[PDB]
Write a protein that binds this ligand. Sequence first.
Ligand SMILES: [Cl-]
Ligand SMILES: [Cl-]
Ligand SMILES: [Cl-]
Ligand SMILES: [Cl-]
Ligand SMILES: [Cl-]
Ligand SMILES: [Cl-]
Ligand SMILES: [Cl-]
Ligand SMILES: [Cl-]
Ligand SMILES: [Cl-]
Ligand SMILES: [Cl-]
Ligand SMILES: [Cl-]
Ligand SMILES: [Cl-]
Ligand SMILES: [Cl-]
Ligand SMILES: [Cl-]
Ligand SMILES: [Cl-]
Ligand SMILES: [Cl-]
Ligand SMILES: [Cl-]
Ligand SMILES: [Cl-]
Ligand SMILES: [Cl-]
Ligand SMILES: [Cl-]
Ligand SMILES: [Cl-]
Ligand SMILES: [Cl-]
Ligand code: NA
Lengths: 160, 158, 160, 159
Amino acid sequence: RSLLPLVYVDAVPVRVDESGDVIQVGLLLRATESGHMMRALVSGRVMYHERVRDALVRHIEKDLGPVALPSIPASPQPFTVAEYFPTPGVTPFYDDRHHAVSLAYIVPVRGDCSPQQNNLELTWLTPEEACSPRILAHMQGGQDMLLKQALAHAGRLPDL
Amino acid sequence: SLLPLVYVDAVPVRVDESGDVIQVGLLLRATESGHMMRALVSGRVMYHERVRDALVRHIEKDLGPVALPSIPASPQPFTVAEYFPTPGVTPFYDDRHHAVSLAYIVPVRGDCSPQQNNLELTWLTPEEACSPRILAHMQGGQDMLLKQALAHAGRLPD
Amino acid sequence: RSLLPLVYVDAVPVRVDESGDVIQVGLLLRATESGHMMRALVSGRVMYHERVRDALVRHIEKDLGPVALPSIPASPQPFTVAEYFPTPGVTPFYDDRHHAVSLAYIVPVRGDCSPQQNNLELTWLTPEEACSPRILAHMQGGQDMLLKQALAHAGRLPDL
Amino acid sequence: SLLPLVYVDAVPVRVDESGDVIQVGLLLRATESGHMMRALVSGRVMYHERVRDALVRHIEKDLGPVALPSIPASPQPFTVAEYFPTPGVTPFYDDRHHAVSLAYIVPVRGDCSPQQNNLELTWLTPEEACSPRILAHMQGGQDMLLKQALAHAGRLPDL
Ligand SMILES: [Cl-]
Ligand SMILES: [Cl-]
Ligand SMILES: [Cl-]
Ligand SMILES: [Cl-]
Ligand SMILES: [Cl-]
Ligand SMILES: [Cl-]
Ligand SMILES: [Cl-]
Ligand SMILES: [Cl-]
Ligand SMILES: [Cl-]
Ligand SMILES: [Cl-]
Ligand SMILES: [Cl-]
Ligand SMILES: [Cl-]
Ligand SMILES: [Cl-]
Ligand SMILES: [Cl-]
Ligand SMILES: [Cl-]
Ligand SMILES: [Cl-]
Ligand SMILES: [Cl-]
Ligand SMILES: [Cl-]
Ligand SMILES: [Cl-]
Ligand SMILES: [Cl-]
Ligand SMILES: [Cl-]
Ligand SMILES: [Cl-]
Ligand code: NA
């Protein structure tokens, strides 16, 4: 962690209609270390000798359950790359533990979903709702921006 | 005649659990000369129609009501294929017009069946689809488009 | 204009550092058809038998002068497609004359620029500056949003 | 050997006024055994180093200080190439380790001189680049990365 950047993945869970239009964004609500509330995207490390899309698979099931039916993007190209730095103010992304370089994807879920393990809740929000300050505020390490870049990428960032 | 046409090209695929492309589907139909051709899911975007709605419509037009396409959330296409009515100008050509086609990978998760003019829908592995035999039957440089689709899916073979 | 969608391009003109990082965006100032002032991206139709990347070149020269030295992307993949509808409220994009389907690109310009023809001025703004309310207010047909999508794509959409 | 490494790959290109790729540049190198091999610009992203900066650094590292690379404004790479330490897991492989490589097309706008580990900087049109001769000389499947790059550029050759 103090030595090299970590390969991560961020997956923005979304509900889409038939045309692929993003209908809702799914945010996880868990507690911070001190029992304060936060909101996050599906985010996690890639393992040695693990493929990225597999990590995507593994992380989705972990946060949402084995019947979430993700549509893992046919293509490896992420919509962006979020560079979480251990020092704030360098990139829009920050994580106190490590320097993490994440391939970020929008991942539609075709199945049913529930919060698991450390995930207390799973909230489906419209783009307008997801981009409420109250919501964004609850997000950490700059994931609120990554969220906004995800919406922007899907052509559904709200004007407010 | 005088305007370039907005088009989409949809590349249907069977993906596995991890979204990895295992099969692509190619529509077998006849040319006006009655010659054999393989094809992508392709056509005009209508006036006042959304691109993603046109993907839905052409998919259904070619593959059926229950193909259950996964239309990409983002309008960012994998490439742009510009069919010029003059050969050699771009990798792509169409005798009828200048068409600017927005190309997408479209996973199909349901039952798919050849409709209207299409004679059959053939699912082929990437290694299969890129065999000289099949490619040779693709028109207007759509063979190049398929390779671009595969290259973008991390599945262009050697 | 009343029968088929038109193929358009939008180019977001930017100043970058050596690291490729977007430092400023170039907004043109001009009149609306009505006399009001607006701010515009570089935007226009692709001509019959004209390649898209060539339409990009043509529109850059046309708005910014022949020595702007744009870096046309090697890749035909736009960062988005902006679908300007002749009806407001259908997409985030609106044009009162046409249905335009536009392939949008961020275009760094490497040379000196000067606002041409009906362009009154050229404004170089930092992302913060470009996303000032008043600025985005001045944009038309949802181009303020397309600008945000462009900044989002570049990883430079402002928090505030 | 407990970690996957964050990597970049750069495909250096000469584009015309319209961004059209006219030639790609291949770096010639020696194998450990001293066979001749050709290469893209690839190397690690150091801790606390931004991707775009590692991109500059490895381009400068290989093409000299005058290459004037056009690093893309967008952090979206044209693809993500996974060199597994085991062959055949993905199209790419590297016995040294597991490298998650972010691939970009990088237009070079200036003088590019071969420096250090490289012996020769070979500029080749796309049709030249995909000659089985050339590709053969590429390791870790970079021949396949080179094609994906060309394909993404609309310039993959029909042979
Ligand atoms: Cl995809
Ligand atoms: Cl994505
Ligand atoms: Cl985007
Ligand atoms: Cl049609
Ligand atoms: Cl449309
Ligand atoms: Cl669309
Ligand atoms: Cl492309
Ligand atoms: Cl796609
Ligand atoms: Cl048109
Ligand atoms: Cl125009
Ligand atoms: Cl065109
Ligand atoms: Cl110019
Ligand atoms: Cl739109
Ligand atoms: Cl609209
Ligand atoms: Cl809308
Ligand atoms: Cl772009
Ligand atoms: Cl505007
Ligand atoms: Cl030129
Ligand atoms: Cl090109
Ligand atoms: Cl890719
Ligand atoms: Cl690239
Ligand atoms: Cl490609
Ligand atoms: Na214009």
